[PDB]
Amino acid sequence: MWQENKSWNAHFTEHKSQGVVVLWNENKQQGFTNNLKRANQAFLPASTFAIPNSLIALDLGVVKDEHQVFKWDGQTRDIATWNRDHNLITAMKYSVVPVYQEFARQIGEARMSKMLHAFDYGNEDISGNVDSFWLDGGIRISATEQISFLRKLYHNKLHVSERSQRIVKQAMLTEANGDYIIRAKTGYSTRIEPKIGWWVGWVELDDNVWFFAMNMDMPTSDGLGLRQAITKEVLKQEKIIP
Amino acid sequence: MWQENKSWNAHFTEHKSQGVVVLWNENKQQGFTNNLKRANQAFLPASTFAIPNSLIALDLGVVKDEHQVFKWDGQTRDIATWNRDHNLITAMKYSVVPVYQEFARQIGEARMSKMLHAFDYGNEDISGNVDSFWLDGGIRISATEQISFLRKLYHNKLHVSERSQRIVKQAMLTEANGDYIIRAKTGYSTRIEPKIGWWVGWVELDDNVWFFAMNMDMPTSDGLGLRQAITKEVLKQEKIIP
Numbered sequence: 374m375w376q377e378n379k380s381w382n383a384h385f386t387e388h389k390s391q392g393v394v395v396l397w398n399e400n401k402q403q404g405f406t407n408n409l410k411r412a413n414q415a416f417l418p419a420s421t422f423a424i425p426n427s428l429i430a431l432d433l434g435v436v437k438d439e440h441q442v443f444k445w446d447g448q449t450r451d452i453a454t455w456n457r458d459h460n461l462i463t464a465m466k467y468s469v470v471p472v473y474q475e476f477a478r479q480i481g482e483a484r485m486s487k488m489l490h491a492f493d494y495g496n497e498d499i500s501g502n503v504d505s506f507w508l509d510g511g512i513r514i515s516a517t518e519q520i521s522f523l524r525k526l527y528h529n530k531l532h533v534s535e536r537s538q539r540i541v542k543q544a545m546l547t548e549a550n551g552d553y554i555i556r557a558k559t560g561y562s563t564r565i566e567p568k569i570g571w572w573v574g575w576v577e578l579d580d581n582v583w584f585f586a587m588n589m590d591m592p593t594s595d596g597l598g599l600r601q602a603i604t605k606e607v608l609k610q611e612k613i614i615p
Numbered sequence: 616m617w618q619e620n621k622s623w624n625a626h627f628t629e630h631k632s633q634g635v636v637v638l639w640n641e642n643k644q645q646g647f648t649n650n651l652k653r654a655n656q657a658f659l660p661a662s663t664f665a666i667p668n669s670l671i672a673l674d675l676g677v678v679k680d681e682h683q684v685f686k687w688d689g690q691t692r693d694i695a696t697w698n699r700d701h702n703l704i705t706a707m708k709y710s711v712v713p714v715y716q717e718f719a720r721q722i723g724e725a726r727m728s729k730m731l732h733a734f735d736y737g738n739e740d741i742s743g744n745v746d747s748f749w750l751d752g753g754i755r756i757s758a759t760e761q762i763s764f765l766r767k768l769y770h771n772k773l774h775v776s777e778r779s780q781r782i783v784k785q786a787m788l789t790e791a792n793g794d795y796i797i798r799a800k801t802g803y804s805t806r807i808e809p810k811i812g813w814w815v816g817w818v819e820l821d822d823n824v825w826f827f828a829m830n831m832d833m834p835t836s837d838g839l840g841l842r843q844a845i846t847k848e849v850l851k852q853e854k855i856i857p
């Protein structure tokens with residue numbers, strides 16, 4: 374099921390990094406990883422929680438559709454792309470935490486807990502503030518657990534409406550060309566050590582789908598680009614992308 | 616509120632070509648073109664008919680979803696990408712005419728005629744073979760009529776299910792990056808003169824949608840890349856994409 378290829382460790386050590394890459398081949402039902410222990414270590418999801426958050430908000434009617442405008446509250450925050458109006462698409466593209474905090478408040482602790490357990494999402498513990506539990510609370514998820522959750526979302530197998538899953542997968546669109554399509558979500562956990570960066574999603578090919586989930590130590594914000602770069606080095610090495 | 620900007624003709628003249636580019640700014644509700652007369656001139660849709668054809672097939676249940684396999688009939692044809700199995704996604708990516716001909720045969724003349732009237736699609740005339748009318752029959756559509764049809768599709772306003780419109784817009788995915796998303800469909804009309812190439816779709820920005828419809832004379836197949844190249848030249852000039 375899960376095959377450890379320690380050869381991939383060079384992709385982190387060459388960048389003075391520490392992390393895990395997890396790949397799942399949907400057609401052969403095989404998984405690969407550089408580090409089995411870290412692949413099964415759970416971390417704060419950070420902005421990768423935007424995928425289950427958006428799913429629940431859509432299914433419960435908190436969000437009508439991907440065109441609904443969420444107004445900026447006129448308060449300037451550190452990330453410049455946050456200080457403007459957003460919809461479901463740009464909220465995910467720019468990881469607009471205040472938009473998702475409002476989602477969680479409208480969803481409520483009771484319904485958030487039931488959906489996360491139905492999703493089998495991580496440890497299913499929303500301990501902490503309902504608007505911040507994925508940033509400084511008790512919810513934790515591993516790379517392999519991200520893969521399992523994403524595989525259900527791809528097949529529309531999650532216990533929400535098919536429309537909700539289609540819309541969220543549309544918002545996950547990150548990159549597309551004649552060779553591949555990448556639907557993914559970035560993450561950056563900073564409020565509790567260890568500071569890590571996430572990148573989870575999948576690569577759609579013509580005749581296969583390659584799921585991926587990676588996290589890596591992120592002591593400073595200068596290495597955020599390594600999240601996508603290290604993953605693409607593994608995808609290139611594995612003949613998945615040219 | 617159309618605006619004719621003959622400056623764009625240089626993008627055609629540089630390649631010793633002739634054609635029309637039509638842009639629609641959805642936010643401002645204003646249009647732009649290099650040739651107003653040709654913008655309203657109707658041609659055979661050719662493979663751009665894959666958009667309404669897939670919509671009808673999905674809504675009628677002829678296609679269950681985007682994963683359903685349409686097996687190759689065994690006949691070797693000129694374009695090698697046609698000689699394999701395809702789903703709704705790869706059929707649109709490779710413009711696999713035999714797949715779409717099979718769609719039209721299962722839809723039938725009566726249901727195809729009424730769907731096109733409901734769509735207000737072009738001259739709504741499906742005269743000819745039920746599996747070739749968009750290639751050598753009587754159906755005609757202009758660039759401005761293509762944009763009219765695409766704007767309804769973008770807002771889920773066509774008189775089919777919202778699900779079928781979402782799936783087709785997923786199949787239209789052509790290119791995406793951090794700057795823009797393009798959902799579009801190419802076309803090459805070769806059976807009846809004049810030989811023309813098509814490119815219709817839209818460019819999704821964070822804050823706006825730019826619908827485009829272009830057609831150009833295509834005497835030989837070696838200029839097909841000019842369909843996207845000239846459109847991007849126009850999009851770059853108007854500061855729509857970097």
Ligand SMILES: *C(=O)[C@H]([C@@H](C)O)[C@H]1CC(SCCNC=N)=C(C(=O)O)N1
Nearest residue numbers: 419420421468470559560561562594
């Ligand atoms: C989610 O992981 C976070 C949020 C919890 O802070 C957001 C913030 C960022 S990048 C912030 C720094 N930008 C430039 N220096 C991301 C991200 O994934 O890029 N998500």
Ligand SMILES: *C(=O)[C@H]([C@@H](C)O)[C@H]1CC(SCCNC=N)=C(C(=O)O)N1
Nearest residue numbers: 661662663710712801802803804836
């Ligand atoms: C639709 O417009 C046609 C069909 C009617 O033949 C298909 C064929 C092509 S050409 C593919 C590349 N051939 C040589 N380079 C297209 C197209 O739009 O590219 N659609």
Ligand SMILES: [Cl-]
Nearest residue numbers: 419420470473
């Ligand atoms: Cl978030």
Ligand SMILES: [Cl-]
Nearest residue numbers: 539540543781
């Ligand atoms: Cl959608």
Ligand SMILES: [Cl-]
Nearest residue numbers: 662665712715
């Ligand atoms: Cl076709």
Ligand SMILES: [Cl-]
Nearest residue numbers: 543546785788
């Ligand atoms: Cl999409």
